[PDB]
Design a binder for this molecule. Structure first.
Ligand SMILES: Nc1ncnc2c1ncn2[C@@H]1O[C@H](COP(=O)(O)O)[C@@H](OP(=O)(O)O)[C@H]1O
Ligand SMILES: N#Cc1cc2ccc(O)cc2oc1=O
Length: 289
């Protein structure tokens, strides 16, 4: 098998190479002017990464094409054979740095909280996440075999997928936001009103840009622009690692398209389980626009 099993670390199932990567990651030192992009997988990481990097380049799109987003925004825990690790990439990254992770809080380098690093967190509704992830598993060959949609959806509801439970991830980081600087966004809000969300990000990172530059960012962070941009669309990675003919990384970009995959039986079982897991939480997600 080329698709190795998940390895559990402190309760969290992880890609095996990412588990190994936690070793060198232990020596990682955060700076006070770092910013961390944190998400459960498939919730808009790449989207918000492109947004934050354009802001960092003061809107200059030629600066944003300097390299693929994975090299401009180092992925902390990342590693795979014949690809440079997130830690190796990080050492050539100039400050102020943007950093990406999907780690639950129980694996997050303590340095990031100690240093009070600003967090941009993005949450997305669980149903869209699930569908997105199922397809991602097929094209991104470091994951184990996804199986049928039905058996993947059952694993997703118990957290037996890479990075574990969606339900715990979005709650723990929601709770963290009351004691650490976290801007907590929803993919759906960004779909609804991208300009509004970008203005929130701007206020959060303490920058100012003219209306015209903001409007130029909305354009270049749209699904369509990001899909054809080879610096955001992951098409330059080796086909041994991601195969786009199986499923593109920039797949649909919709809120609400889970309706086209979930059967009615799956939906009813998912809803009942979801109300149990999310009962004590004050988060309200939108499943569609
Ligand atoms: N500019 C954009 N607008 C809306 N969705 C975007 C986007 N850029 C990427 N995405 C979507 O974000 C999801 C992947 O997120 P991550 O970057 O966290 O892996 C994919 O969702 P779909 O598979 O629903 O299309 C991808 O298509
Ligand atoms: N193989 C593989 C990959 C897994 C992966 C997991 C999470 C993520 O945010 C990005 C990723 O990019 C990859 O190329």
């Amino acid at each position: 098998t080329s698709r190795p099993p998940l390895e559990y670390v402190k309760g969290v199932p992880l890609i095996k190479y990412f588990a190994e990567a936690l070793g060198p990651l232990q020596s990682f030192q955060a700076r006070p002017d770092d910013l961390l992009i944190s998400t459960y997988p498939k919730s808009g990481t790449t989207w918000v990464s492109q947004i934050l990097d354009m802001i960092y380049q003061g809107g200059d799109l030629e600066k944003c094409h300097r390299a693929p987003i994975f090299m401009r925004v180092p992925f902390l825990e990342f590693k795979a054979p014949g690809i440079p690790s997130g830690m190796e990439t990080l050492k050539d990254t100039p400050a102020p740095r943007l950093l990406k992770t999907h780690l639950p809080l129980a694996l997050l380098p303590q340095t990031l909280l100690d240093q009070k690093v600003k967090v941009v967190y993005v949450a997305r509704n669980a149903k869209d996440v699930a569908v997105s992830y199922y397809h991602f598993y097929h094209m991104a060959k470091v994951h184990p075999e996804p199986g049928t949609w039905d058996s993947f959806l059952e694993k997703f509801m118990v957290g037996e997928v890479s990075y574990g439970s969606w339900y715990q991830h979005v709650q723990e980081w929601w709770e963290l936001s009351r004691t650490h600087p976290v801007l907590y966004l929803f993919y759906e809000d960004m779909k609804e009103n991208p300009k509004r969300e970008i203005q929130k990000i701007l206020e959060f990172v303490g920058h100012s840009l003219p209306e015209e530059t903001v409007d130029f960012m909305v354009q270049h962070t749209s699904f369509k622009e990001m899909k054809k941009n080879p610096m955001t669309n992951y098409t330059t990675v080796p086909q041994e690692f991601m195969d786009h003919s199986i499923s593109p990384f920039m797949r649909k970009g919709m809120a609400g398209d889970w309706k086209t995959t979930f059967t009615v039986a799956q939906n009813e079982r998912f809803d009942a389980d979801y109300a149990e897991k999310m009962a004590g939480c004050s988060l309200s997600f939108r499943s569609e626009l």
